[PDB]
Design a protein around this ligand. Structure first.
Ligand SMILES: O=C(O)[C@H]1CCCC[C@H]1C(=O)N1CCc2c(OCCO)cccc2[C@H]1CN1C(=O)c2ccccc2C1=O
Length: 285
């Protein structure tokens, strides 16, 4: 009985919502709020515990980029703060290998990070690893074949279609094939040995198209597009299906949740969030 957790987001100001969707019965749970409201964060799971990483607190009182790591235990319904990152990271990407959380790219004020760092839950310590070849904010991250892929984003001057690949054992980055479309704030995940890149922003318009990286052929190819255009969308996989949650379409903050079936190559709206939002962090446990 794994649930889809969504944490934080933005709608007029940065949000503190933690809510859990159940794809079996379609119910939404109302869990303990984040201690600090955050947008542009990322979510992940290690050892049955949900982690909220980075982001930014937009309010009427002002703006503050977050270096925070906070840990949620579904058994206790309690948020506990963890050791902070070396620097604040808004519009962050996150991935997990051997129960270690990688925090990739993002912004602090005018700075656009190429730097990367790794968290050890057993020691409660962050440590820097080799930096990315490109500065990326709004970067999508995916873990495949025990390698951490960084996909798309924004380097301060240009929106990016390029992508690169981290090698944990060698501690080095390597550029892979570039995407068909330029994407910042895309939903990036792994399903059936492929990296999917859904939606995002190309510089002009928000996108509904989805493309899929195959490792053997080393090529990106398009699959069925989403019903609604969206950037800054939450994304995850649950029982062999991709779920995209919310986002921004240039005018509206979406409450819509669409679900991809790779067998039929079709998207469909499975539920709606309790309110519309963009820039959420998502994970499953
Ligand atoms: O971070 C920010 O300074 C804030 C500024 C206020 C709007 C929210 C937030 C933002 O700008 N976000 C959301 C996070 C995010 C992102 O993070 C993914 C990890 O969770 C990756 C790529 C792009 C974005 C953007 C998308 N976005 C909007 O929602 C939006 C609304 C109105 C005008 C322009 C924009 C826009 O550009």
């Amino acid at each position: 009985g794994r649930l889809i957790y969504t944490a934080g987001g933005y709608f007029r100001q940065s949000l503190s919502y933690l809510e859990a969707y159940n794809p079996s019965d379609g119910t939404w749970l109302r869990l303990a709020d984040l201690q600090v409201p955050r947008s542009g964060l990322a979510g992940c799971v290690v050892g049955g515990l949900l982690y909220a990483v980075g982001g930014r607190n937009n309010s009427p009182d002002g703006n503050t980029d977050s270096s925070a790591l906070d840990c949620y235990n579904p058994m206790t319904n309690q948020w506990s703060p963890c050791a902070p990152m070396s620097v604040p990271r808004n519009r962050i990407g996150v991935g997990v290998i051997d129960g270690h959380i990688y925090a990739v790219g993002g912004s602090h004020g005018c700075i656009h990070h190429n730097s990367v760092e790794r968290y050890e839950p057993e020691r409660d310590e962050w440590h820097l690893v080799a930096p990315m070849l490109t500065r990326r904010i709004g970067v999508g991250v995916a873990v495949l074949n025990r390698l951490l892929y960084a996909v798309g984003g924004f380097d301060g001057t240009n929106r990016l279609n390029s992508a690169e690949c981290y090698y944990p054992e060698r501690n080095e980055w390597r550029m892979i094939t570039a995407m068909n479309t330029i994407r910042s704030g895309a939903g990036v995940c792994v399903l059936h040995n492929c990296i999917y890149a859904a939606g995002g922003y190309d510089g002009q318009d928000q996108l509904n198209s989805v493309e899929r990286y195959d490792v053997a052929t080393a090529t990106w190819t398009f699959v069925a597009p989403m019903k609604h255009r969206r950037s800054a969308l939450g994304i995850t996989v649950h029982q062999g299906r991709i779920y995209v949650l919310g986002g921004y379409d240039g005018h509206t903050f979406l409450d819509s949740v669409e679900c991809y079936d790779p067998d039929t190559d079709t998207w469909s709206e499975v539920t709606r969030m309790t309110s519309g939002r963009s820039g959420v962090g998502v994970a499953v446990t």
